[PDB]
Design a protein around this ligand. Structure first.
Ligand SMILES: [Cl-]
Ligand SMILES: [Cl-]
Ligand SMILES: [Cs+]
Ligand SMILES: [Cs+]
Ligand SMILES: [Cs+]
Ligand SMILES: [Cs+]
Ligand SMILES: [Cs+]
Ligand SMILES: [Cs+]
Ligand SMILES: [Cs+]
Length: 129
């Protein structure tokens, strides 16, 4: 599924991400924009053999099982395919664990490089939420 911006903002809010760990909704929407372009089906191979999955590009070394990532811990206890679903619940539940891992949203390099410090409220501007 390719979400619209406000549609994804609403779905994220519906799943408890607004201000989760202190990160406002616009931070999450911004991260999803630059990780996946709002496409739940996005997958991208990393240099190290792991793969990133879904709206928030969650990896298979630490967080989900894809069966092909040596050393996989599967800390979200889910198949990586579950992170490609139209229903963002699994991606949200796992993201909540990731952002609680110690470094906040810096876990997403694209958030650090493209969202952090910016006017992230712009991502929710105009949205009926
Ligand atoms: Cl915001
Ligand atoms: Cl933090
Ligand atoms: Cs909070
Ligand atoms: Cs990647
Ligand atoms: Cs990525
Ligand atoms: Cs990690
Ligand atoms: Cs596990
Ligand atoms: Cs940790
Ligand atoms: Cs960490």
């Amino acid at each position: 599924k390719v979400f619209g911006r406000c549609e994804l903002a609403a779905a994220m809010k519906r799943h408890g991400l607004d201000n989760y760990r202190g990160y406002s909704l616009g931070n999450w929407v911004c991260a999803a924009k630059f990780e996946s372009n709002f496409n739940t089906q996005a997958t991208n191979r990393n240099t190290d053999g792991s793969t990133d999955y879904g709206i928030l590009q969650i990896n298979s070394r630490w967080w989900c099982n894809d069966g092909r990532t040596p050393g996989s811990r599967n800390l979200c206890n889910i198949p990586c395919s579950a992170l490609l679903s139209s229903d963002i619940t699994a991606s949200v539940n796992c993201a909540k664990k990731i952002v609680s891992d110690g470094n906040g949203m810096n876990a997403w390099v694209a958030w650090r490089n493209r969202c952090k410090g910016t006017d992230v409220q712009a991502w929710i501007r105009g949205c009926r939420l």
